[PDB]
Amino acid sequence: MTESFAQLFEESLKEIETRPGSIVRGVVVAIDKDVVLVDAGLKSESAIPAEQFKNAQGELEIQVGDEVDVALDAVEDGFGETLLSREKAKRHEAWITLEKAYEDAETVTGVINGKVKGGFTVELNGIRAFLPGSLVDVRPVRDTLHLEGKELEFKVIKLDQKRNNVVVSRRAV
């Protein structure tokens, strides 16, 4: 039957969004020794390095037929390449987990590695946080260089993720 191309493309457009930056899940067609090929249904399949897919333990928890959610860099790189980066999705999920952990205030870690305006600053896999000048540690600690260079093991209280800021505080933990 003559269901027009315009009307059919309308439904297909409604199914999938082409906005850059957003995250959509794609079936992994195959894995080579250093790259993973992911089909998200766009113009073409993406070729993401396996190091990105490699887990914290240097292993490939991913597999054929697995579904994982990948952030959309662009529809085309100029060579018909649907550039997709799942580590951006990892960063977005980490910001969401950081927001949850700064709302729930549970135990968490992350290498406190820099100097904030108030004091020392923390970095934790997508969480750029602060431990202030007098609040780097509870006591009068010169361990802002422990809050700049050593992992803070605490909760987060106040965070502005859009500002790339959190409070990796000298809290109860």
Partner 1 sequence: ATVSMRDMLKAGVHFGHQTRYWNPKMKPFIFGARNKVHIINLEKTVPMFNEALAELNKIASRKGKILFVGTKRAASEAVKDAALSCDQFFVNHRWLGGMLTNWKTVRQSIKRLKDLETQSQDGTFDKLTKKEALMRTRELEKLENSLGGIKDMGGLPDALFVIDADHEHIAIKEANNLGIPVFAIVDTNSDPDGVDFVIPGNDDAIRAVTLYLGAVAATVREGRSQ
The reply to whether 91 sits in an annotated binding site is no
| Cβ atoms of 60 and 88 closer than 8 Å | no
Q: Do 121 and 148 form a contact (C-beta atoms < 8 A)?
A: yes
Partner interacting with residue 7 (select from partner 1, RNA, none; CB below 5-8 Å by kind): none
Residue tagged 């600690």 (tokens): 141
Assess 7 for contact with partner 1 (CB under 8 A): no
Q: Can you give the three-state secondary structure of 13-34, one letter per residue?
A: HHHCCCCCCCEEEEEEEEECCC
Q: Work out whether strand 46-49 and strand 148-151 pair parallel, antiparallel, or are unpaired.
A: unpaired
Cα(15)–Cα(45) distance, integer angstroms: 18
Q: Is 64 in the site for partner 1 (CB under 8 A)?
A: no
Instruction: Out of 108, 116, 136, 156, point to the residue binding RNA (CB under 7 A).
Output: 116
Query: Binds 32, which of RNA, partner 1, none (CB < 5 to 8 A, cut-off by type)?
Result: none
Is 117 near RNA (CB under 7 A)?
yes
How many residues touch RNA (CB under 7 A)? 7
Please identify which residue in the block is written with the tokens 């597999």. Answer: 63
Taking CB under 8 A as the criterion, the residue among 50, 75, 105, 141 binding partner 1 is 75
Query: Which parts of 36-55 interact with partner 1 (CB under 8 A)?
Result: 39, 41-45
For position 165 contacting RNA by CB under 7 A, the verdict is yes
Nearer of residues 4 and 63 to partner 1, judged by Cβ: 4
**Angstrom distance (rounded) from CA 120 to CA 132:** 6
163 annotated as belonging to a binding site for a ligand: no
Residue 158 near residue 166 (C-beta atoms within 8 A) = yes
Residue 117 interacts with, from RNA, partner 1, none (CB under 5-8 Å by kind): RNA
Q: What residue numbers does the annotated binding site for RNA cover? A: 139, 142
Residues that bind RNA (CB under 7 A): 116-118, 130, 163-165
